[PDB]
Design a binder for this molecule. Structure first.
Ligand SMILES: *[C@@H]1O[C@H](CO)[C@@H](O[C@@H]2O[C@H](CO)[C@@H](O[C@@H]3O[C@H](CO)[C@@H](O)[C@H](O)[C@@H]3O)[C@H](O)[C@H]2NC(C)=O)[C@H](O)[C@H]1NC(C)=O
Ligand SMILES: CC(=O)N[C@@H]1[C@@H](O)[C@H](O)[C@@H](CO)O[C@H]1O
Ligand SMILES: CC(=O)N[C@@H]1[C@@H](O)[C@H](O)[C@@H](CO)O[C@H]1O
Ligand SMILES: *[C@@H]1O[C@H](CO)[C@@H](O)[C@H](O)[C@H]1NC(C)=O
Ligand SMILES: *[C@@H]1O[C@H](CO)[C@@H](O)[C@H](O)[C@H]1NC(C)=O
Ligand SMILES: *[C@@H]1O[C@H](CO)[C@@H](O)[C@H](O)[C@H]1NC(C)=O
Lengths: 729, 49, 49
């Protein structure tokens, strides 16, 4: 009636002495089973033995934990044993232990700084999860590039899983980027740098603009240039540019000046609004062997005469290809019981595909060709008919393919982008599989999302019964996040595809969700595949600030009302934005900490184990051959079942087949940026009342610009917290 | 003799190579190494290449 | 399965086949050349197998 299938879902990744979900599959009932995953040592003392009461048709996942290891990493062999009363089976795989750490980072006002000041910085620690973590440290120190520690503290402990600091500064350091150092008890190194320079602020504010990406056909170059040396005085005078076609063709012995052109669309500087300029690309002869351009502006000053020149935007953009299209949501892998959606769009300079440009959908080897055209957004969506072999490789054009060069030099050259794709199949010995469409688009949080996926069942069901089972599963941070299950209705012969599913979006998942579902069968074949989904940045504890409103200067008395979970600790870096405008937070965001996270996923193969040996081989089963002919031994490159276990990112131990090409050994063979005041306005720490604290802000008058906070909050009552943006005028 | 370009080439398993039975010691090879022909409903005759 | 020449008898041997059509046998199957460096690549050491 039912042949048993067992499968124990075992992320070989071990986050230590922490809850990490693991689980099992069993169905099609049989006598008795109480299996045990034992990571026995050479002796059997380092056994990570977890024997557990088991049954059929159930999902009930224990997140047991493990004490510390001897090494930081150590491969140990894992023979889960099939504790049946009359059947016992093993298979040894290395386990990817790791004495992994709790995670940390650093906060500073800036990286560049001013000489002679005191830097102010803070330090943080949390865990795998995004909750705080109070804990000591070995040490900390700032280091200078000369191999030496300019600042240091020793083995403090955190009040709330963080600490704030400062450090003075000499006015005579080495002008260079300096850095800070901490080591965990393991030796866990984090790094957050900081430079200093009292470079002279250039008086002038000469600013140029120009189009970047050019093509084989243009008409206009709408170039805006304006110099307000103080940001608020565009001088009444003249301006002249030097813009020039340039670039000897990779030749330097020419002994001359390689300017192909030099035009000066000079003009009278107007204080109204700004000077602007609008130059044409025709006189520049925007031709193929009309060579690269360079841009350099003569910004002359009135009643001073100390004229400035600036080479900005100068390095032109040799657009070797013209009419550049791409893919959009092209299914990286496809299937055979469905005509399926790839997608492609187009961009060109400004990023404007011609409306209703019709295309040449060269999706072949099924020779399903059927033209289409661009939607509003360049895009296009399309199924393609399916009775062919595993390999399929597709492409689409508006132009047509030419492989027609006359002579192998072709210094003469031209190109148009083509979105060609190669694809491979899925298994289906089990005679049922799904195609889970991707959600590779917008993803708001604090919701759920019914997924769209379409099962088949080849040959209907050979027997099946009234009801089989299907389960949908997601890994997270080395542990499964949730347990998804379902069943379908009764039918003995059909090809249906209207399956139901959903999952709630909050948090608690890698930046992706390798969601996986599979086709549990009574006949020892199970077919699935992962399904990777975006995880857009959203936090446990949201929060927002608000200030005593932005008004005239002198009013020192202000506020900064901030309102979050009832209890927390909080950074309060109320600062000037223009210094952050100067150098954006290329190294700070909520998304940052999501990705400053290391080891979000790690397929278990990684470095330590090159592979896993298993029992069968390809030469085996030397019994009668095909009746029609002789079928030798060979295989397919298509995406596979055993690998869907590693596409999940884990291993397992099973009787349902993964029988495919292992091997036989020896068969028969035997730039410069503007700056204003670096003055860091506010920097402090507070704790929220239950109702949302508000701190009287102190105006820094007599300095008007864009203003902003670098604040941040934290607690275990709701995890960390950030209102990632609220500026001030 | 066969006048057949091909039969069911495309198959899940390995594509059979020969239209008719060809081997070093096949069945009709016994009739050939005899040197005699025959006319039969069982599987004997072939063209060579 | 090694054997030996009888004074009155030659080798009378069987091998148990459990595989596909492609087969081939030999004896004195230890080396074809006693010495591969033989000399100046000018005269090949050949003994019957
Ligand atoms: C390519 O696309 C076409 C649809 O335009 C798919 O054709 C579909 O094929 C299935 C299976 O043959 C059809 O179901 C049954 O077909 C038989 C044909 O004799 C019919 O007698 C049954 O009543 C039943 O309809 C299905 O009807 C058909 N699509 C439509 C129009 O309903 C085809 O499967 C696609 N390529 C492949 C083979 O993946
Ligand atoms: C001729 C020229 O300078 N090109 C464009 C012009 O087509 C457009 O009307 C204008 C609007 O600001 O921007 C510029
Ligand atoms: C194993 C095999 O297929 N080869 C033959 C087998 O058919 C035969 O029955 C046996 C008798 O000892 O000799 C061997
Ligand atoms: C279940 O599977 C085992 C192994 O094939 C077998 O020994 C047993 O007879 C099967 N049936 C039951 C009901 O135990
Ligand atoms: C196993 O070895 C460890 C090493 O510390 C020891 O503590 C323990 O007592 C030994 N035996 C067990 C499993 O208790
Ligand atoms: C030759 O085969 C016999 C019969 O089994 C065996 O006893 C003997 O060890 C073999 N001789 C050699 C070369 O060892």
């Amino acid at each position: 009636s039912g042949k048993p299938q067992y499968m124990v879902l075992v992320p070989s990744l071990l986050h230590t002495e922490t809850t990490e979900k693991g689980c099992v599959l069993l169905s099609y009932l049989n006598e008795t089973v109480t299996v045990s995953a034992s990571l026995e040592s050479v002796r059997g003392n380092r056994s990570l033995f977890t024997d557990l009461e088991a049954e059929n048709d159930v999902l009930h996942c224990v997140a047991f934990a493990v004490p510390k290891s001897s090494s930081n990493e150590e491969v140990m062999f894992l023979t889960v044993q099939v504790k049946g009363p009359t059947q016992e089976f093993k298979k040894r795989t290395t386990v990817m232990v790791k004495n992994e750490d709790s995670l940390v980072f650093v906060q500073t006002d800036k990286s560049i700084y001013k000489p002679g000041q005191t830097v102010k910085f803070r330090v943080v620690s949390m865990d795998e999860n995004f909750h705080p973590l109070n804990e000591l440290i070995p040490l900390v120190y700032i280091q200078d590039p000369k191999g030496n520690r300019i600042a240091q503290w020793q083995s403090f402990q955190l009040e709330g899983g963080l600490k704030q600091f400062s450090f003075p500064l000499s006015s005579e350091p080495f002008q260079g980027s300096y850095k800070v150092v901490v080591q965990k008890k393991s030796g866990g190194r984090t790094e957050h740098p900081f430079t200093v320079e009292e470079f002279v602020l250039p008086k002038f504010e000469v600013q140029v603009t120009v189009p970047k990406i050019i093509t084989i056909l243009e008409e206009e170059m709408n170039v805006s240039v304006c110099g307000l040396y103080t940001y608020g005085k565009p001088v009444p005078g003249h301006v002249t540019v030097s813009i020039c076609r340039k670039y000897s063709d990779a030749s330097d012995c020419h002994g001359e000046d390689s300017q192909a052109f030099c035009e000066k669309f000079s003009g009278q500087l107007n204080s109204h609004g700004c000077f602007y300029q609008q130059v044409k690309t025709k006189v520049f002869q925007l031709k193929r062997k009309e060579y690269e351009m360079k841009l350099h502006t003569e910004a002359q000053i009135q009643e001073e005469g100390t004229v400035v020149e600036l080479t900005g935007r100068q390095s032109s953009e040799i657009t070797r290809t013209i009419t550049k299209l791409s893919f959009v949501k092209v299914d990286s892998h496809f299937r055979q019981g469905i005509p399926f959606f790839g997608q492609v769009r187009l961009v060109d300079g400004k990023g404007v595909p011609i409306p209703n440009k019709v295309i040449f959908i060269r999706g072949n080897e099924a020779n399903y060709y059927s033209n289409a055209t661009t939607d509003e957004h360049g895009l296009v969506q399309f199924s393609i008919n399916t009775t062919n072999v595993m390999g399929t490789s597709l492409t689409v054009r508006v132009n047509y393919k030419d492989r027609s060069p006359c002579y192998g030099y072709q210094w003469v050259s031209e190109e148009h982008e083509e979105a060609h794709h190669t694809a491979y199949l899925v298994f289906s010995p089990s005679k049922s599989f799904v195609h889970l469409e991707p959600m590779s688009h917008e993803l708001p949080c604090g919701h759920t999302q019914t997924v769209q996926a379409h099962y088949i069942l080849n040959g209907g069901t050979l027997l099946g019964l009234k009801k089989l089972s299907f389960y949908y599963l997601i890994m997270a941070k080395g542990g499964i996040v949730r347990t998804g299950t379902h069943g379908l209705l009764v039918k003995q012969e059909d090809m249906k595809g209207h399956f139901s599913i959903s999952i709630p979006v909050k948090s608690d998942i890698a930046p992706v969700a390798r969601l996986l579902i599979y086709a549990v069968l009574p006949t020892g074949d199970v077919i699935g595949d992962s399904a990777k989904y975006d995880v857009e940045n959203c936090l446990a504890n949201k929060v927002d600030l608000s200030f005593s409103p932005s008004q005239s200067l002198p009013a020192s008395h202000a506020h900064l009302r901030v309102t979050a979970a009832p209890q927390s600790v909080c950074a309060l870096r109320a600062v000037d934005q223009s210094v952050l405008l100067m150098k954006p937070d290329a190294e700070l965001s909520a998304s940052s900490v999501y990705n400053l996270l290391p080891e979000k996923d790690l397929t278990g193969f990684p470095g330590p184990l090159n592979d896993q040996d298993n029992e069968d081989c390809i030469n085996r089963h030397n019994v009668y051959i095909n009746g029609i002919t002789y079928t030798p031994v060979s295989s397919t490159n298509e995406k596979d079942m055993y690998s869907f276990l590693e596409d999940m990112g884990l291993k397992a131990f099973t009787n349902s087949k993964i029988r495919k090409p292992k091997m036989c050994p020896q068969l028969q063979q035997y730039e410069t940026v503007r700056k204003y005041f670096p003055e860091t306005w506010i920097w402090d720490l507070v704790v929220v009342n239950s109702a949302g604290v508000a701190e009287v802000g102190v105006t820094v008058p007599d300095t008007i610009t864009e203003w902003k906070a670098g604040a941040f909050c934290l607690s275990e009552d709701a995890g960390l917290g950030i209102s990632s943006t609220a500026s001030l005028r």
